[model samples]
Target chain A: TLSLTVNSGDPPLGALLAVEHVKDDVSISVEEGKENILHVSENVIFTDVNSILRYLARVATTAGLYGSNLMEHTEIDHWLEFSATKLSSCDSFTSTINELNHCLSLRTYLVGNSLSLADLCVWATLKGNAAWQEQLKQKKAPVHVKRWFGFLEAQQAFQSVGTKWDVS
Target chain B: DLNSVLGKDYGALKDIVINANPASPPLSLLVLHRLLCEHFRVLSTVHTHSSVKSVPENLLKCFGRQDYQLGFTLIWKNVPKTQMKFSIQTMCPIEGEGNIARFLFSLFGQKHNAVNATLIDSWVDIAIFQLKEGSSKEKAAVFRSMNSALGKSPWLAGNELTVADVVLWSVLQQISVTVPANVQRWMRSCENLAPFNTALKLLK
Candidate 1:
């Protein structure tokens, strides 16, 4: 339904994966950037990561990625907000990791019963964090976080982001 | 039925009670109370709507109820004696400021598309992180962004006021930052609204 360019120095692998998930044509390009932005149009631009993730999820082939209804949407939004703030702070990072581990202990997905954008975004955050990765390899206290992370990382879409995390 | 557009009547949603912190001061959760009132009173506040109709006029009727939720209140204790989950129903009470803010934002009826929704989320994060804890340079960077955003819209996210505007305004209240002209004007515009006005007053 739309075409846009993602301005980033390195390949935005997750972007390609989510964009590829869309069935209807959404023309996209990865270009070099002085700063990270998704040029939505001559008039529209998105500068934040969570916003871009929400936009991409909205356009995905499956509606479940963004969500199906109001409650689910709020739930996903809450998780995205958590991802935006908690992932960046060492102060809350351990607590949040444990929270998500416990949250995922009973359910497979973060929001409703599926692999929504919440899973994708939070998974990427945990995958890249040095501390979380340390815990992942050591098989840390938050077993469900490791389980959930491992479950999503193995997915075909996430592979484009590259590399199975060493969890031996 | 265009349920997303027409709006939902949440008058019937049950078991609503907010357990506030023992030491939290008075009217601190007014930001949350106003946002909740937005859901209860104004159904179609999604988009194309600057100047959200103020909450039902009267401090007693609107914010009078003792049963309101405090899930959005920012208590000073960065480190609690315990994990300190602020419960608003559901497991673990969803701690961290913007996490609940984003969920509260989604409670509206008429909504923006993915881009606008995400923009609102961006502002919440901006208010929570950059404005609240950043260096002077960091504060100025977000100030510039806020000023530029206000330059285009009457509100931060868009034509209508949103959770972004609400949270940003609340955050601005606690901090003493020199704002640019557009933002300065935008704050006045927000002050004109009853929720923002009453919220500011309860502080004094």
Candidate 2:
């Protein structure tokens, strides 16, 4: 079983969302710490969300959420990194969100037609902010961003995480 | 010989088949083999192919013409019948550099994201772009960007060294152009690694 050490707030939501897709034994637990991490085994531990998600995506390759091939995997990796470094910060947050809004204008998913790790990682990063959530909920967000966000939010897997927004 | 090359005993070993474009040395394959050896005990019969006839039928099933541009086929002990093909592409279209960089990250258990991944790709673009017929302007612009970043941080993607550093260093190694002090320093750091050092030995 993969044991995840997460927090109630600022949790590794990507991994939590991934639990709905994986075919393996995985469990999550709350740990009083500043970091979100995954303990894969006695020796393997991942401290970041992208790293954890990537490892699990490999385990659940048949799920078609991680990637199907090298090119797809590269795209997924590109977006995962892009979301983390660009979307998570305040300085470039507006531009990053705008770029995402533009990218999602046509496609239902980030990299390809189907959902991928890129979707979850990017969603997780964007979803953690109360302001972003408020904007999204009020329909004040960009058209494509709102559309894509709504599509993912309605997923059985994403909904299963019991994610809440404090837009009020 | 494989055992010695791998730096450990891969017991019950057979052979390692390598089929690369004989035009140039397969540096990426050499590096990847060394990296994989650090994790898995790989042992199998090796083959080299410069033609389609030389490639095994079972392995060819997984490849396309472009897929064979530069790649390797790994056959392990119990799975001798199955061949695992890994494509090594340096100059891919669009974000091709990121593809190769991510491939390196996947193999080496490194953390990869688009921000830095793009940075690596951008640097590679700069390397190739500068080498173009008369792109002195392109060369200067890339050097400024790369040098500025390397000056602030010891590594390209912050303090932690990543495959971005490796790919950039490898790309720059080819051209006979003068680089900024920080970029040169960063290249030196990447070249100092044992795996890169070993792979580079083949080039020499």
TM-score per prediction, in order, is 0.75, 0.49
Please give me the DockQ of candidate 1 compared with the native complex: 0.35
lDDT of 1 by residue, B6-49 (tens): 11333223322233232322232466557567555422111111
Q: Over 4 Å off in model 2, which ranges?
A: A23-34, A163-168, B1-100, B103-204
For all candidates in order, the CA lDDT equals 0.61, 0.57
Off by over 4 Å in 1: A1-17, A23-25, A32-34, A61-63, A91-93, A163-168, B1-12, B17-29, B35-89, B97-99, B105-108
TM-score (chain A only) for the predictions, listed in order = 0.82, 0.83
Largest TM-score belongs to which candidate? 1
Error of 2 at A37 (Å): 2.6
lDDT of 2 by residue, A115-161 (tens): 89889888878887655776766777888888888889888778767
The DockQ of each candidate is 0.35, 0.08
Q: What value does the lDDT take at residue A84 in candidate 2?
A: 59
Compute the lDDT of residue B189 as modeled in candidate 1.
91
